[PDB]
From a paper:
The crystals of ALSV MTase bound with SAM and SAH were individually obtained by co-crystallization at a protein/ligand molar ratio of 1:3. The structure of ALSV MTase in complex with SAH was solved at 2.1 Å, with Rwork and Rfree values of 0.210 and 0.236, respectively. In each case, clear electron densities for the bound ligands were observed, which enabled us to define, at the atomic level, the SAM/SAH-binding pocket. In the complex structures, the SAM/SAH molecule fits into a conserved pocket located at the edge of the ALSV MTase core region. The pocket is surrounded by helices αX, αA and αD, strands β1-β4, and several adjacent loops. The SAM/SAH molecule lies down in the pocket, within which the bound ligand is stabilized by multiple hydrogen-bond interactions. These include residues S99, G129, W130 and D183 of the MTase forming five hydrogen bonds with the methionine/homocysteine group of SAM/SAH, and amino acids L148, N168 and V169 mediating another three hydrogen bonds with the adenosyl group of SAM/SAH. For ALSV MTase, the binding affinities of SAM and SAH to the refolded enzyme were determined to be 8.1 ± 3.3 μM and 4.1 ± 1.8 μM, respectively. In ALSV MTase, this loop is of short length and high flexibility, devoid of any stabilizing contacts with the SAM/SAH ligand. SAM/SAH binds to ALSV MTase in a 1:1 molar ratio and 2. the SAM/SAH-binding pocket in ALSV MTase is largely unoccupied during expression.
Alongshan virus (ALSV), a newly discovered member of unclassified Flaviviridae family, is able to infect humans. ALSV NSP1 is a typical flavivirus NS5-like protein. It carries two essential enzymatic activities: the methyltransferase (MTase) and the RNA-dependent RNA polymerase (RdRp). The flaviviral NS5-MTase functions to catalyze the methylation of viral RNA cap.
Numbering used by the authors: 42 to 84, 98 to 149, 154 to 294
Write the structure that this text describes.
Amino acid sequence: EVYKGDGYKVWKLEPSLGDPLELGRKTKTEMNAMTHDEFDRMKPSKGYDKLRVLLDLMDRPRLGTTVDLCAGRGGWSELVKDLEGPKGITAVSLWEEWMADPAIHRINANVKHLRPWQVDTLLFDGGEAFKRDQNLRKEENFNDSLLDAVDAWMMQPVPPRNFVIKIQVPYTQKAIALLEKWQVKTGKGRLVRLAGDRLSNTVMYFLSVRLETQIRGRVTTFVRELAERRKDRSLT
Ligand SMILES: Nc1ncnc2c1ncn2[C@@H]1O[C@H](CSCC[C@H](N)C(=O)O)[C@@H](O)[C@H]1O
């Protein structure tokens, strides 16, 4: 249909030439130098609605046994509970703080330590944008390490049938390599940029929809496009 397709709710991202790490660092550098005004112009929980959009993009799959990594205040877990009941949903976070249905089973643990188990659905909403005063590599390394935690859940003998994985910094070499590997492991997976996400971040989501390859070139298109739209939204 005109709805099922796009680029209505996600950006159109065809592969393009270029180095996504260099372009990503470039537009991060540009954004760090913006005035308060420029940055403003460009700039149980809200995640609930976010996941709704994402799960609708995936044609509303049956979720079954679900683990929600970095569950935070619980918007995603609450959405799963409303969709299918509290029986199949497990939330993992370091407890900030739980705003969701208290009947949802929760584990207070660091997702980097916890050994994975077999799930039907894998959710991950970890990641943090760093503020301007830091060396760029600190944000890159922090979010890379977080995604590495997701790797063990993806690479187990029976991988998740559904997954929604947030990629905070999609242009690092490790992020791209991980996404390519999960595509080989699962035979699935597409990286999307939500239309209407803030331009002040670089967030994409890896969804278990039909395989879409050439992730590196599409991340390049995404970072170039993002740099353009950040520039556009300037005074005067
Ligand atoms: N290493 C880690 N282990 C477990 N949780 C972590 C973590 N690093 C960050 N987090 C947690 O992950 C959460 C991500 S915010 C996720 C919000 C949630 N999806 C919602 O809709 O409400 C934060 O609350 C943070 O406390």
